[PDB]
Amino acid sequence: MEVIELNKCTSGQSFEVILKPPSDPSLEEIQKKLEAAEERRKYQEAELLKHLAE
Amino acid sequence: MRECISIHVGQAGVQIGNACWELYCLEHGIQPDGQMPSDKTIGGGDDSFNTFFSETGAGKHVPRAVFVDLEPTVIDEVRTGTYRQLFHPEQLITGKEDAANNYARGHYTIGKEIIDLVLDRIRKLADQCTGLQGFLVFHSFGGGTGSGFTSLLMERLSVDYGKKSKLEFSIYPAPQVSTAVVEPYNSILTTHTTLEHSDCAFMVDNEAIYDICRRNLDIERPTYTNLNRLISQIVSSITASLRFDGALNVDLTEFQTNLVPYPRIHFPLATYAPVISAEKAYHEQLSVAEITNACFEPANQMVKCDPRHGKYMACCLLYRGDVVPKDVNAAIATIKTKRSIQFVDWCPTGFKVGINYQPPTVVPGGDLAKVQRAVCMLSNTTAIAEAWARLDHKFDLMYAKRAFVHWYVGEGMEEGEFSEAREDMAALEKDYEEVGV
Amino acid sequence: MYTFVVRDENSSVYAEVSRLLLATGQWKRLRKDNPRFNLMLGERNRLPFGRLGHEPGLVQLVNYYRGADKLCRKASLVKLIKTSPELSESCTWFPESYVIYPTNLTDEREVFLAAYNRRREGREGNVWIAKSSAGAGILISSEASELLDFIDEQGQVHVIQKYLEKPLLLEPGHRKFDIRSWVLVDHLYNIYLYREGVLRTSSEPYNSANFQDKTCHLTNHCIQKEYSKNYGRYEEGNEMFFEEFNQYLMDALNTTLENSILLQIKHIIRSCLMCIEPAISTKHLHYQSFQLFGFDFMVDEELKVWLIEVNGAPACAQKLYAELCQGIVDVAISSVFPLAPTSIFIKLHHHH
Amino acid sequence: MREIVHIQAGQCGNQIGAKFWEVISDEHGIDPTGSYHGDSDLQLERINVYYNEATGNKYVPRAILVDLEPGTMDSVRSGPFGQIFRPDNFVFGQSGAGNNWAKGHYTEGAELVDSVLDVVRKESESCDCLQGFQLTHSLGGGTGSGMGTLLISKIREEYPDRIMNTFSVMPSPKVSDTVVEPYNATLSVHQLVENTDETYCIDNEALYDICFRTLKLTTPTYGDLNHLVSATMSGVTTCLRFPGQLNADLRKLAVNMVPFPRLHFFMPGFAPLQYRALTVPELTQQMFDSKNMMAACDPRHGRYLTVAAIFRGRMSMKEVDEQMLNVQNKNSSYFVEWIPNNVKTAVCDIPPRGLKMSATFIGNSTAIQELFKRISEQFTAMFRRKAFLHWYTGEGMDEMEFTEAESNMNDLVSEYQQYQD
Numbered sequence A: 001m002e003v004i005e006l007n008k009c010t011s012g013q014s015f016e017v018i019l020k021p022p023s024d025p026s027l028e029e030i031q032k033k034l035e036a037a038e039e040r041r042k043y044q045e046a047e048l049l050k051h052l053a054e
Numbered sequence B: 001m002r003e004c005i006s007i008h009v010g011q012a013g014v015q016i017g018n019a020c021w022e023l024y025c026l027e028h029g030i031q032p033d034g035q036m037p038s039d040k041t042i043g044g045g046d047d048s049f050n051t052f053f054s055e056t057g058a059g060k061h062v063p064r065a066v067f068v069d070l071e072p073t074v075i076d077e078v079r080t081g082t083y084r085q086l087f088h089p090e091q092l093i094t095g096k097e098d099a100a101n102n103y104a105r106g107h108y109t110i111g112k113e114i115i116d117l118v119l120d121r122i123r124k125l126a127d128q129c130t131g132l133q134g135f136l137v138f139h140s141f142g143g144g145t146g147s148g149f150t151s152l153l154m155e156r157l158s159v160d161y162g163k164k165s166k167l168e169f170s171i172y173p174a175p176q177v178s179t180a181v182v183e184p185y186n187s188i189l190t191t192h193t194t195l196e197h198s199d200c201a202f203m204v205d206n207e208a209i210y211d212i213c214r215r216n217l218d219i220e221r222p223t224y225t226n227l228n229r230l231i232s233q234i235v236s237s238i239t240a241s242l243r244f245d246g247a248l249n250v251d252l253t254e255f256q257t258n259l260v261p262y263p264r265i266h267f268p269l270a271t272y273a274p275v276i277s278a279e280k281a282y283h284e285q286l287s288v289a290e291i292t293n294a295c296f297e298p299a300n301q302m303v304k305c306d307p308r309h310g311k312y313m314a315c316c317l318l319y320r321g322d323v324v325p326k327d328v329n330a331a332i333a334t335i336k337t338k339r340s341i342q343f344v345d346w347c348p349t350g351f352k353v354g355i356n357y358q359p360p361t362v363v364p365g366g367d368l369a370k371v372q373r374a375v376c377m378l379s380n381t382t383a384i385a386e387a388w389a390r391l392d393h394k395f396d397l398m399y400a401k402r403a404f405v406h407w408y409v410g411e412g413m414e415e416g417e418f419s420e421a422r423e424d425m426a427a428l429e430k431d432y433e434e435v436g437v
Numbered sequence C: 001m002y003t004f005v006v007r008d009e010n011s012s013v014y015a016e017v018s019r020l021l022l023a024t025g026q027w028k029r030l031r032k033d034n035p036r037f038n039l040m041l042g043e044r045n046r047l048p049f050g051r052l053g054h055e056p057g058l059v060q061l062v063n064y065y066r067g068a069d070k071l072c073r074k075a076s077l078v079k080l081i082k083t084s085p086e087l088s089e090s091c092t093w094f095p096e097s098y099v100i101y102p103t104n105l106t107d108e109r110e111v112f113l114a115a116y117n118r119r120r121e122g123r124e125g126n127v128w129i130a131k132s133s134a135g136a137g138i139l140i141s142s143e144a145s146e147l148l149d150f151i152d153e154q155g156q157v158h159v160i161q162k163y164l165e166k167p168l169l170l171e172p173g174h175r176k177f178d179i180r181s182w183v184l185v186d187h188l189y190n191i192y193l194y195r196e197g198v199l200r201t202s203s204e205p206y207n208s209a210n211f212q213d214k215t216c217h218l219t220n221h222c223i224q225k226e227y228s229k230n231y232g233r234y235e236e237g238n239e240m241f242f243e244e245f246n247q248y249l250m251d252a253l254n255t256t257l258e259n260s261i262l263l264q265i266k267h268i269i270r271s272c273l274m275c276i277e278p279a280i281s282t283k284h285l286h287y288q289s290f291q292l293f294g295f296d297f298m299v300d301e302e303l304k305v306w307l308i309e310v311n312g313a314p315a316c317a318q319k320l321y322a323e324l325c326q327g328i329v330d331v332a333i334s335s336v337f338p339l340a341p342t343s344i345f346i347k348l349h350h351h352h
Numbered sequence D: 001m002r003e004i005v006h007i008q009a010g011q012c013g014n015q016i017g018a019k020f021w022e023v024i025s026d027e028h029g030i031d032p033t034g035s036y037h038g039d040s041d042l043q044l045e046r047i048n049v050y051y052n053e054a055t056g057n058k059y060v061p062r063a064i065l066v067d068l069e070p071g072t073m074d075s076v077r078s079g080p081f082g083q084i085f086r087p088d089n090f091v092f093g094q095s096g097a098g099n100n101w102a103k104g105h106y107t108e109g110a111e112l113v114d115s116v117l118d119v120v121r122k123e124s125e126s127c128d129c130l131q132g133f134q135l136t137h138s139l140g141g142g143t144g145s146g147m148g149t150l151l152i153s154k155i156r157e158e159y160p161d162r163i164m165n166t167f168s169v170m171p172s173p174k175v176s177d178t179v180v181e182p183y184n185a186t187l188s189v190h191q192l193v194e195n196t197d198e199t200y201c202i203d204n205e206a207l208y209d210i211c212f213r214t215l216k217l218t219t220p221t222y223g224d225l226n227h228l229v230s231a232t233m234s235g236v237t238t239c240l241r242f243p244g245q246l247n248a249d250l251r252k253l254a255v256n257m258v259p260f261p262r263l264h265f266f267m268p269g270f271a272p273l274q275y276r277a278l279t280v281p282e283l284t285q286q287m288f289d290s291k292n293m294m295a296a297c298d299p300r301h302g303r304y305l306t307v308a309a310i311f312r313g314r315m316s317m318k319e320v321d322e323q324m325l326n327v328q329n330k331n332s333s334y335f336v337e338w339i340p341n342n343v344k345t346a347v348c349d350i351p352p353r354g355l356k357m358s359a360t361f362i363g364n365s366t367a368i369q370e371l372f373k374r375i376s377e378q379f380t381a382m383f384r385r386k387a388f389l390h391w392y393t394g395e396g397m398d399e400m401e402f403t404e405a406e407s408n409m410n411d412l413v414s415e416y417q418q419y420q421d
């Protein structure tokens, strides 16, 4: 049961009690993901329009 | 002094953010018009409260906050609410139609068209900072915006601010206040893509906040206002160290240093006490021992789970009010002799304690009673993995039949992203089991 | 109309509880994967406690205490007894035991040999028994070399504990036995001891000069009915019930079952369960638990009672399934889910 | 500002559509002249969803009336709230459709559809952010069925990413005008399977039985049936017309109710169906009772994929959650277990006119296959003998198109059957 690193100021204090010792995607890659999904959306809508045109 | 920028995404993030800045203003003596009489340095200063508030020449104290929602009805509340004068229009961003509870719609379809706008408004706040620490990101798991747009925003923030910390406050889905069936999908999709981008995330299960409001506040049917005032108290306890003079958790980097020894396991459990009803005739004020002991009662945790059957990696005690270290250590001694507190063998069995003498502030006319002392415990337990298991199981039930998947594929998401996200959660569950069992 | 699910099709006890529940006409059984249940008759292994108590408007109850394996595991029990101040290492009703890991894997090898070398030097009886939870796999020997080598040939944790060389032998027969007690702990953590126990007796005369033939030393109902040639001779199915046993203790030893044995059994049951109560209590939890325990005791020739092990999923004596199973419904299930005596249990009061 | 454009086509679609605007106009405080005279701000909060605002604070329904003969729309213009509709939004021909799907879809309807789309486009161009469309029509006639489904097709082509929603009245031999109704309904259902996101199946047989047995109306009229549709249309749209977050718009509702794109056909229900107070338990028991269902399908013959409930009036929201959770927990054998929490409840404070409180039920039940089975059997009984086909081949149609619609609906039945097991 030890207390260490006691810091006191006008608005409070802090300390540490020890009870026992121990024993990314680049900007380019994000655009590709967003544009790949936008392209799959466009492809799906084109197939829908092609189906409606038939 | 180093500044923190708060980002609020979706309805949950915006309405929670609205409740926090209401509380922040009451705590720092800031009026709805932005004026702070106690601030003797007009139009500037590097005080601790300046980490969250900028200042104009007229003495206005302006939150360092951005609000983003794909539909305008919730942010319109802020524009015409009590604190409409705090923020200028550039800080409030709204689209015309939302993500419809669809992660793919918030992340890809609508996110792609508004991401650059949001980053621009964030850059404006960042240019007012002499030493930006990082970001506090509020959002829900279940909403299409809270889930889908947040993960995209986190990815870009890691690109635009590589050396900046990012903390989350995430609302875990609870059916008692949810009307979207696909929220397990959105929760797991957004955890997968945000995991490597968040340094520390505080999950709040609405199921827990709901029961605390019914049990301790005697609210038969809690509303979002009731839930959000209680959440902003916990948030306030967590961010107080950044807004007031102190020596514990004085910058965002310290949250990871003190609470997250393993990067993927960055979801500390929050426990708060005491929550006393304001309608009570008059409550016997609880002691340091009793509020500390309450930190190990499941009924007061932000996520319902059993820490007795996990292992602790870190534990912080954040006290507010009439508390002296003598009484804190005495209570901790008594709790070790009664409670089941098992730490991992590669981590010391100890507690970091922080004390702020200013007792909790309560919104006038709110639900919470003014108390003389309160504590919020942040502990990294493997037991919080129960919330992952619950969520992953619901995901598996629906995905086995591909239920609702066509809504996501229709927005341009590939089905493989579902299984990629689920496998990443399976790996997350295995990490918790390796550390705690 | 209450709802329950069955997730252990191999449980004779809760198969009868499930049958009783349906008879009441007020309980409905659901598929094992339906989450909208009031009561879960869960599986033995990897029961998903983390998914209980998160269904809005459902009070949910499960027939297992999360963490009770600390008591029902051979190695766990030894560790719990030696490290818990409530039980202490000097606990007088548990045989001297040591946790021994096979060398192909803390471990208490050197601690065991020290106590062993002490007995051998002091002419004292030095007979030990090695066993594990991965058995149907038991070895009784007086030489430490054989005990340790037997465990290395295996690959799971074992426990070596002192063998009671002076057991109480029933007459006629000169035969060993063990006492099984059923104990039900409900959601309020009341400890109920079933008034009916069973003595699982060995139908072979106890022989201290030959531990190679393990039929007269192991009183398991399966061993006596497979390797014993006098099965069912003295009592039906090598099962003597309390009425007969009590009458025997009066004719032979001029004492009662309550005075000489049952007081110690009740004391032992309380000590074990009160010890782990803080760790497994569901008092302030989002779901409730209860569980049926099978305590196994040994009685030596001095009428001192020794705890052998605790079983977390015990079976019952055929003649006592009806009474006990009904008792589980009365105090464990209907106490939380009431339906639209002279209790069969003995409440062991205690401080919570 | 999430605007919905309303379309009503044919005799049935215009008579039910008329009553619908009459009912919700009352609930929003709009009188027959479009002048607001309510007393609650909740009435105007989301008024722009169904109404346009004209000069003089006039509220004009965003509605388009379509027919191939003038008769029915002349009655509406002469009806109670006839003056409230935009005069330019009446689009009608003179030939009629003769209860002939082919005439509404390929011949007579094709001549008129372009002028209808011009008015649709005019209403959309003045929408801040258009949610989508809702169509009221019957499937047993020619105009609403044949031309209505042609409209849906051409609307989806021009607005592919907007939500398409319909209230579709299914024919029944017990309330029949002509024997070709199964032909017209089977042809329409295929269109609906492809081009609508949500379809409320309103069965004229269920409406009849409810009038005869429950309401005790000796000789039910079309007017009596339409009173039940009005009340139902008002209940299911409450979430769109007043504040809330539970299925607050068309796309969010579709996301919560439609797990598979083709299974988007809903069974609606209403409660109550005279001065006595109705408790929350009674509202809940009745709302889930088959006798209160508008599709004439026994829910106990299938399983609910998803359920949306709306409670209107000043009541105990806690007592609502308790009773809703009591119906699920007491009959969980009728809810698929692989969609967690598939029952969602919404509460609105404004009750319908003349009722302290009410409940509206929207179920996506696999039992709806019973409805498509009845139609399929009636279809095949005639088609096997090619009976009455000449009315259709005379309009350019081929027998193959009937064979394909038949197979398409039998596929739809089989799709419901697999998710029921």
Ligand SMILES: Nc1nc2c(ncn2[C@@H]2O[C@H](COP(=O)(O)OP(=O)(O)OP(=O)(O)O)[C@@H](O)[C@H]2O)c(=O)[nH]1
Binding pocket: B009, B010, B011, B012, B013, B015, B016, B069, B070, B098, B099, B100, B101, B102, B106, B140, B141, B142, B143, B144, B145, B146, B147, B171, B172, B173, B174, B177, B178, B179, B180, B183, B206, B224, B227, B228, B231
């Ligand atoms: N605690 C709390 N939870 C909220 C609040 N608002 C919404 N939620 C929860 O968030 C989830 C729904 O996500 P939302 O945040 O409303 O959706 P969104 O982020 O606006 O995204 P959209 O789909 O575009 O509307 C549900 O689980 C709600 O219970 C709130 O104000 N407080």
Ligand SMILES: Nc1ncnc2c1ncn2[C@@H]1O[C@H](COP(=O)(O)OP(=O)(O)CP(=O)(O)O)[C@@H](O)[C@H]1O
Binding pocket: C095, C129, C131, C135, C136, C161, C162, C163, C164, C165, C176, C177, C178, C217, C218, C219, C220, C296, C298, C308, C309, C311
């Ligand atoms: N220390 C000891 N001294 C004497 N006999 C012992 C003993 N340990 C075990 N036994 C004998 O072993 C038998 C049961 O062994 P144990 O209970 O450890 O294995 P097990 O768990 O597979 C049987 P069960 O679980 O049904 O009680 C008892 O009948 C007892 O007579």
Ligand SMILES: Nc1nc2c(ncn2[C@@H]2O[C@H](COP(=O)(O)OP(=O)(O)O)[C@@H](O)[C@H]2O)c(=O)[nH]1
Binding pocket: D009, D010, D011, D012, D013, D015, D016, D097, D098, D099, D100, D138, D139, D140, D141, D142, D143, D144, D145, D169, D170, D171, D172, D175, D176, D177, D181, D204, D207, D222, D223, D225, D226, D229
């Ligand atoms: N519920 C209801 N059904 C109707 C009404 N009018 C016609 N129907 C039904 O609709 C079908 C006839 O279609 P109808 O609308 O008259 O033909 P259309 O004008 O060419 O679209 C038959 O099944 C009728 O039973 C009505 O006012 N109410």
Ligand SMILES: [Ca+2]
Binding pocket: B039, B040, B041, B042, B043, B044, B045, B046, B047, B055
């Ligand atoms: Ca200043």
Ligand SMILES: [Ca+2]
Binding pocket: B158, B162, B196, B197
């Ligand atoms: Ca980073």
Ligand SMILES: [Ca+2]
Binding pocket: D111
């Ligand atoms: Ca012509």
Ligand SMILES: [Mg+2]
Binding pocket: B010, B011, B071, B098, B143, B145
């Ligand atoms: Mg939203």
Ligand SMILES: [Mg+2]
Binding pocket: C309, C311
């Ligand atoms: Mg055993």
Ligand SMILES: [Mg+2]
Binding pocket: D011, D012, D141, D177
């Ligand atoms: Mg007609």
